[PDB]
Amino acid sequence: GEIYTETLQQTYAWTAGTNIPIKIPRNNFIRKIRVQLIGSISNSGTAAVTLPSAPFPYNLVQTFNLSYEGSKTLYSVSGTGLGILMYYTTKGQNPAYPAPGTSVPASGSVNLNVMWEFDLARFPATMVQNIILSILTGQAPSGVSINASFYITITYERVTAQEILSEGGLGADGEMPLATVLPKVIEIPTFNVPASSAPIHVAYLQPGQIYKRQLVYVINSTSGINNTDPTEYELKIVRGVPTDKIKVSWAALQAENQAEYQVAPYSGASAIIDFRKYFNGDLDLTHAPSDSIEYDLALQNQDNVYSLYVSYVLPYYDQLAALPAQVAAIVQQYVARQKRRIKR
Amino acid sequence: GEIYTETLQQTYAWTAGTNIPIKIPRNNFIRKIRVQLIGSISNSGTAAVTLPSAPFPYNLVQTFNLSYEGSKTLYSVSGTGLGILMYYTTKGQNPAYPAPGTSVPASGSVNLNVMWEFDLARFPATMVQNIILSILTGQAPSGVSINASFYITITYERVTAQEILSEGGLGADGEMPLATVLPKVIEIPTFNVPASSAPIHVAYLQPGQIYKRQLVYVINSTSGINNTDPTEYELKIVRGVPTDKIKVSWAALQAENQAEYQVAPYSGASAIIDFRKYFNGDLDLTHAPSDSIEYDLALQNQDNVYSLYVSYVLPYYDQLAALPAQVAAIVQQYVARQKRRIKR
Amino acid sequence: GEIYTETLQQTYAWTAGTNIPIKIPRNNFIRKIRVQLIGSISNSGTAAVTLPSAPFPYNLVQTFNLSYEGSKTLYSVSGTGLGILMYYTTKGQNPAYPAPGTSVPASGSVNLNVMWEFDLARFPATMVQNIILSILTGQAPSGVSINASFYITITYERVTAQEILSEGGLGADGEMPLATVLPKVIEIPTFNVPASSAPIHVAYLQPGQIYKRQLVYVINSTSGINNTDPTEYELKIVRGVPTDKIKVSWAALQAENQAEYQVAPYSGASAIIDFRKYFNGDLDLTHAPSDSIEYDLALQNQDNVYSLYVSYVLPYYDQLAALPAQVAAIVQQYVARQKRRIKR
C-alpha cells in the first residue's frame, strides 16, 4: 500500500531502572518502529568522567519488549542485544553516541543519541490489540546523568481491504492476512557455559519458527562484553547423522562479518551467523522435532552466552502450504517479500 | 459403586534411608491411598533439640513411588513434593506434626504424625498387577530419632462388571475400562536454574498428558526451602508466535494461592498454577509437539527448582476421541468426573 | 562382496596432548577400522613406577573422532569410552597391556598394546569424501613415557556396482546405497548428576537413530572410574503413561553383563544395557518425538556420567519404509545384516 512515516509527539523521559511502556498507535499496518534515546550525558563533577565502554551506550536501555495483546511477544531483546544487532546490519553506521570510553568535559556535557529498530515486516496492527513497546531502561553510567527521552518513529503501510485479498485474504481464523509474517526477535541467554577447547553444547534452537540469522555474544564478569573467549563456534545438526553446518573458528566467523557486514567486529566477543548461507534459503524449524539443531562454543574462561535470533513465524504457515499451486505461487510471493523486510 | 475404606493391618517401621516397599491389595478399584508417619520423635539427649524447619517433617520420607506392574508409575514424588501439594489442596490442614522448628524436650519426646495422599481417581486395581507403593524414607533429623511407622488406608470403589460396560466397557486392548483416567503425579527437578531478573527458561512440559496444576518451589543451598528467590514465574507457549499464559510476579502468584487455596504460602519459595484458569479446561499436551510450553523463573540467587505436576493420562485417549457423539457424550461425562477426583 | 583386510604402512607416533589426524584410504567400502597403540611404557627413573589404574591404558588416547566430509561424524568417543565398549563386546579379551596398576621396572620398561575397533557396517567409503579418523591422544602416565605408534587396519568389502543394484540401488539423492547403515557411536557426557538413592533423571536418548546398546559408566573425582556409586540404573519411557523398561539394580545390571558378555565387570562403575532385550529388536527413535526416553542413576556420591551409545542411522530410512512389500523384504534383509555387523 502506501508506506508513510511519522514520529509520535509523545516522548518518554529516560530514568534509571524504570519501565516505560509505549503505546504504538494502530493506524494502518506497521512496517518498522525506530526508537531513539536522544539528549545528553551531563557531568557536574570536578573531573571529566569517562563513559563506560561497550555495550554503552546501548545498555542504557537494559531491555526491550514489543508485543501485542500484551501476551503475544514480537520482540524480546536487550539494549545490548538489539543494539549489537543494529551495529551489524547497518555497517556499524547506526547512531550510537557517545562512543564507548568518551569523556564528558568536567562540569560540562556530551551528546546522547542511540537507536534501535524493530522490523515488523507488514504487521496487521489494526486487526490486533495494543501494540505495546515496553522499554525497561538500565542504569545511568557512573558519575554522569543521562538527560534524554525516547522518540518513537513508526512506519505505516496503508494496506487496504482489496490488497489484503490480493495476497490470500485472511487467515483460517481470519485474524491477520493469510500472508502475514510476524517477526520473532527473541533472545535466550545461557548461563555459565564452561571454558573448553572443544565446542561444548550451548543450546538447541527450539522449533516453531524460521531462523534468518543468530547474534551470539559472550559476557565475561571482568571484561564484560570486551573479552576474547568465544574461539570456536559450531552449528551442529544433532538429529539424524551428526552433521556440522558450521565448525568455524571465532576469528573466521568475525571474518564472514567483515565481508558480510563490511564493518569491524563489535567487540572480540560477538558475531552473526546467517542461516541462509549454510542451508538453502532459511533454516526452518516450524515442523522439525526439537533439539535437532544446537550451536556450540569453545570459551577461554567460563562465561554467559546470549543468543539473539532474528526469526519469524507464519501464523497460517499451514494454509500457505495447503494452498493450490496457483494461489500458493502468489501468496508465497508476498510472504517471500515480507520475510526479507525484517533484516535488523 | 460402593466406595469403602480400610487400613491395611501390616505396617512398616520408619528406618532412615531405606526403601520400604508396600503391597496395596487389589480387592476392588482404588480411589485413594493415604500414608501416615505415626509415632514420635525422641530426644534422649540432655538439651532440648529443635526439629529442622520446612520441608520437615515432610522430608522424613525422602521419596514416594506408587506404580503397578513394576513398570507403570502412577506417582513419583518426594515427601517434600507430595507433602507441599498436600499443604495447599487442604487449606494447610494436612496432618504434619510436629511443625517446623518444634522442640523435643530434653530427655522427653514429641509427636510424629504426617500424611500423604495419592488420588488415583478410580484406578482399575483388579485388572492390573502389583500395586506396590514404595516409600524411600529420608534422613532422621539430627539429635532426635524417628520412632514411627506407616499406615496405608486404602479407598476401594466396588465397580461392577455391569457398571463398567455402562461407561464404554473396556479399552481397545481391554485392560482397563475405556473411561480410565490414570493419575500421573510426577515431579521433575531442575538443577542450577541461574540467577536472573527476567524469567529465564526453566523446563518444558513434556507432552503425553493433560496437566491439571503445577507446584513449583525453589531450593536454596543455605535457606533450604525458606528463601525468596523465586520472583518472576512465567508459562510461555514457545511453538509458533511466542505467547504468555502467565507472566505474574511471585508475590502475585502466591496471591492467587491466598484466594485459591485460602492458605498462607507454604514458604517464600513455593506456589501453584491451575491450568484450567489459564487455558480453557485442563492444559492438554497428549498430542501437542514437544517443547511447545515451558515455564520460567526469575531467581534471586542460583538454586534448584522442583516442579511437581498433577497431570493424568487417558490410556485409550483415542477411542474416547473416536467414539460416536452419541457414546462419547456419556463416556466423557465419566472421564470428566474422574479427572476432578484426582485433586491432591 | 570381497572382504579383505590390510594395515596401512604409515603409523603415527603417540605424543601427549596432540591431535593426530589419519586419512583412511577409500579403496572399497569400509567394514571395520582397528587402531593399536603398540610400543612400550619406559621408566627411566630410579624407583619402579606403577602405572595409573583404569581407565589406563585406554585413556592414553583421550578421544576418537571418525567422520567423512569433515562434517559428518561416524564416531565421537573417548579412548576410555570406546575402550570400555571394547572391553565388553570381546569378553574382556580386547588387547590392553599393560594392565592397570602394572609396575615398569626402575630404569627398565613394560609392553604397550591397546586397541579400539570402529564398526562401520559396510560404509560406502568410495562414495563419500575424506574419511579422517582424528585421534586426540591423552596424557603420558606420570613417571613413565609412552613409546608407541598407531596401526590402522582397515577391512574393505569389494562391493560392486552390480551388487549395489541388488540391495536397492542408490539412495534418494543417490549418494550411498539405499540400504546403507551408517554407525553413529556418539558419547554424551553429563556433569554433576546429584547423589540420590532413587534413580534421578540423568539424560534422554534423543531421537533420530536406532539405539543398539548403551554403555554407561560414572567417574568419581576420588576413585576415577573405580568407585561403586552407580547403584540403580533405570530406562524410563517418559512420553505417555510413565513406563519402565529397566529398573534393574547396579549389581544386577553387571549381572546380565556376566551372562551376556561372559566377563567380569570392567570396574564397579560401569555397565551395558542392550535395547534388543528391552524392546522387541532395537530401540528406534528415528521418529519418536524428543525427550521420550531417558535413563536414570541413583548415585552414592555426585559424579559425572558418560553415556556411550552404539547407535546407527539409516540415511534414507524413509525410502526403506516407502519401498514395495516386494522390495522392502530384500532391502530389509541387507539393512538387517548390516545393523548386526555394527556390534562393537
User: Which residue shows C-alpha cell 491395611?
Assistant: B8
B199/A75 Cα distance (integer angstroms): 15
Q: Distance between CA A316 and CA A167 in Å, rounded?
A: 13
Torsion angle of C-alpha atoms C320, C321, C326, C332, degrees rounded to 10: 50
Data resolution in angstroms: 4.5
Of the candidates C4, C43, C46, C56, the residue with the CA atom closest to the CA atom of residue C25: C4
Tell me the three cell numbers of residue B327.
457414546
Angle at CA B249, nearest 5°, toward B246 and B250? 110
Peptide bond into A57 cis (omega under 30): yes
| Through-space distance between the first and last CA atoms of chain A, rounded to whole angstroms | 22
Question: B73 and C198 in contact by Cβ < 8 A?
Answer: no
Cα–Cα dist B154/B167, whole Å: 24
A242, A290, A292 member nearest C184 (Cβ): A242
- Measured in whole angstroms, the distance separating CA A144 from the mean position of its chain's CA atoms is 28
Helix or strand or coil: residue B330? Answer: helix
Mutate to test the interface with B, among C201, C202, C241, C304 (most CBs of B within 10 A): C241
CA nearest to C292, candidates C213, C214, C204: C204
Helices B250-261 and B79-89, packing angle to 10 deg: 60
3-state secondary structure of A344: coil
For residues B65 and B74, give the distance between their C-alpha atoms in angstroms, rounded to a whole number.
8
What are the DSSP calls for A75-107, one per residue? EEB-HHHHHHHHHHHTTT-S-EESPTT-EE-TT
Amino acid at B107: S
Which residue's entry shows cell 490486533? Answer: A128
Q: Which residues of A touch C289 (CB under 8 A)?
A: 289
| β-strand partners of C246 | C235
Q: What is the enclosing helix (H) or strand (E) of B260? A: helix B250-261
B contacts of C194 (beta carbons < 8 Å): 191
B278 touches chain A (CB under 8 A): no
Q: Would you state the cell numbers that stand for residue A243, as one nine-digit string?
A: 552433521
Q: Do A240 and C208 touch (CB under 8 A)?
A: yes
Judge if the upstream peptide bond of residue B194 is cis by omega within 30 degrees of 0: no
Q: Chain A within 8 Å of B301 (Cβ-Cβ)?
A: no
Residue A289 has its nearest CB partner, among C72, C186, C207, at C207
Distance between CA B160 and CA B166 in Å, rounded? 10
Write down which chains contact chain C via at least 3 CB pairs under 8 A. A, B
Tell me if residue C253 falls in helix, strand or coil: helix
Q: For cell 519401498, what's the residue? A: C323
Closest chain A CA to residue B289 = A289
Phi-psi region of C260 (alpha: psi -120 to 50; beta: other; left: phi over 0): alpha
CB C140 within 8 A of CB C146: yes
Grid cell 535470533 in the structure block, residue: A309
B183, β-bridge pairs: B312
Q: State how far the Cα of B171 lies from the Cα of B174, in Å rounded to an integer.
A: 4
Among residues C81, C58, C226, C43, the alpha carbon closest in space to that of C137 is found at C58
Cα–Cα nearest to A144, from A114, A113, A105: A105
Quick one: which of A122, A120, A124, A119 has its CA closest to A174? A124
The 3-class SS string of A148-180 reads CEECCEEEEECCCHHHHHCCCCECCCCCCECCC
In angstroms, rounded to a whole number, what is the distance separating the alpha carbons of residues C176 and C170? 6
Distances (CA, A) of A170 to A74, A176, A231, A315, A342: 20, 6, 47, 11, 21
Give phi and psi for C248, each to the nearest 5.
-95, 140
B341 and B121 in contact (C-beta within 8 Å)?
A: yes
- The answer to whether the beta carbons of residues B140 and B89 sit under 8 Å apart is no
Cell of B167: 461407561
Q: Give the other-Cβ count within 10 Å of A340's Cβ.
A: 11
Q: How far apart are CA C250 and CA C248, in angstroms?
A: 7
**Residue in chain A nearest B206 by alpha carbon:** A290
Cα(C182)–Cα(C128) distance, integer angstroms: 12
Residues making up chain A, counted from first to last: 344
* Contact between A117 and A32 (Cβ < 8 Å): yes
The C-alpha cell that represents A86 in the structure block: 543494529
The SS3 of residue C58 is helix
CA–CA gap between residue B141 and residue B313 (Å, rounded): 37
CB distance from C252 to chain B under 8 Å? no
Which residues are B187's β-sheet partners? B308
Alpha-carbon dihedral sign for residues C120, C125, C128, C131: positive
Among residues C35, C119, C122, the alpha carbon closest in space to that of C79 is found at: C35
Instruction: Residue count of chain B, please give it.
Output: 344
Maximum distance among all Cα pairs of chain B, rounded to whole angstroms = 72
CA distances from A232 to A248, A304, C258 (A): 6, 15, 43
The whole-angstrom separation of Cα B25 and Cα B126 is 9
Q: Are B32 and B119 in contact (CB under 8 A)?
A: yes
What type of residue is A201? Answer: H
Please answer whether residues B113 and B35 qualify as being in contact, where contact means their C-beta atoms are separated by less than 8 angstroms.
Answer: no
Residue A71 CB coordination number (10 Å):
16
Give the up-direction half-sphere exposure of residue B43: CA atoms within 13 A in the CB hemisphere: 20
Q: What are phi and psi of B234, to 5 degrees?
A: -165, 115
Burial class (CB in 10 A: 0-12, 13-18, 19+), B109: middle
Which chains border A (3 or more CB–CB pairs < 8 Å)? B, C
In this structure, what are the phi and psi dihedrals at residue A45, rounded to the nearest 5 degrees? -75, 160
Q: For residue A121, what are the contacts with CB-CB under 8 A and spacing of at least 6?
A: A31, A181, A182, A183, A312, A338, A339, A341, A342
Question: From CA A135, how far away is CA A76, in angstroms rounded?
Answer: 10
Q: Select from C186, C163, C164 the least CA-distant residue to C176.
A: C164
Chain A nearest CA to B234, separation (Å): 11
Q: Where are the beta strands (DSSP E) in B210-333?
A: 210-219, 232-237, 243-246, 270-274, 283-284, 293-298, 303-313
Asked if B194 is an interface residue toward chain A (Cβ–Cβ < 8 A), one would say yes
What ranges in chain C are assigned the alpha helix state H? 79-89, 161-165, 250-261, 317-321, 325-341
Residue A30: alpha-carbon gap to chain centroid: 17
In angstroms, the CA B64 to CA B77 distance is 5
What is the C-alpha end-to-end distance of chain C, expressed in Å? 21
Distance (Å, rounded) from C-alpha C197 to C-alpha C232?
8
Alpha-carbon gap, residue C344 to C341, rounded angstroms: 9
| SS3 state of residue A113 | strand
Helix (H) or strand (E) holding B340: helix B328-341
Residue pair C142/C60 in contact (Cβ under 8 Å)? The answer is no
Beta bridge partners of B20: B135
The span from the CA of B160 to the CA of B164, in Å, is: 6
Is there a contact between B102 and B136 (Cβ–Cβ < 8 Å)? no
**How many CB contacts within 8 angstroms connect chain B with chain C?**
56
Cα B210 to Cα B170: distance, rounded to the nearest angstrom: 21
Cβ atoms of B96 and B114 within 8 Å: the answer is yes
Residue B203, judged by CB atoms within 10 A of its CB (0-12, 13-18, 19+), counts as: middle
Collapse the DSSP code of C321 into the 3-class scheme (helix H, G, I; strand E, B; otherwise coil) and give the result.
helix
Parallel/antiparallel/unpaired status of strands C185-193 and C75-78: parallel
Report CB contact under 8 Å: C198, B62. Answer: yes
Phi/psi of residue C325, each to 5°?
A: -55, -15
Grid coordinates representing C303 are 559424579
d(CA B219, CA C104): 51
Q: Hey, CA dihedral for C98, C101, C105, C108, is it positive or negative?
A: positive
Bin B298: left if φ > 0, else alpha if -120 < ψ < 50, else beta: beta
Please tell me the distance from the alpha carbon of residue A134 to that of residue A154, in angstroms, as a whole number: 15
Kindly state the DSSP code that residue C69 receives in the 8-state scheme.
T
- Decide: B255 and B193 in contact? Cβ < 8 Å: no
Q: Output the nine-digit C-alpha cell for C73.
A: 561424524
Nearest to C63 by CA among C139, C171, C3: C139
Assigned C-alpha cell, A227: 573479552
Identify whether the C-beta of residue C127 lies closer than 8 Å to the C-beta of residue C56: no
Q: Which residues contact A183 (CB under 8 A, 6 or more apart)?
A: A74, A75, A118, A119, A120, A121, A123, A310, A312, A342
Cβ of C206 and A245 within 8 Å? no
Q: Are strands A200-204 and A182-193 parallel, antiparallel or unpaired?
A: unpaired
Residue A57, C-alpha cell as written in the block: 551506550
Of C198, C200, C247, the CB nearest to B70: C247
Contact B241 A206 (CB under 8 A): no
User: Looking at the complex, does the CB of residue A244 fall below 8 Å from at least one CB of chain C?
Assistant: yes
Distance between CA atoms of residues B217 and B55, nearest Å: 11
**Helices C79-89, C250-261: inter-axial angle, 10-degree rounding:** 60
Among chain B residues, the shortest Cα distance to A209 is held by B240
DSSP state of A136: E
Would you call B238 and A208 a contact, using CB atoms and an 8 Å cutoff?
A: yes
The answer to whether C207 contacts chain A (CB < 8 Å) is: yes
Q: Which residue has cell 575424506?
A: C130
Named by the residue before each, gaps in chain C exceeding 2.5 A from C to N are none
Characterise B17 by phi-psi region: left (phi > 0), alpha (psi -120 to 50), beta (else).
left
With cell 516409600, the residue in question is B135
Q: What is the residue type of A100? A: P
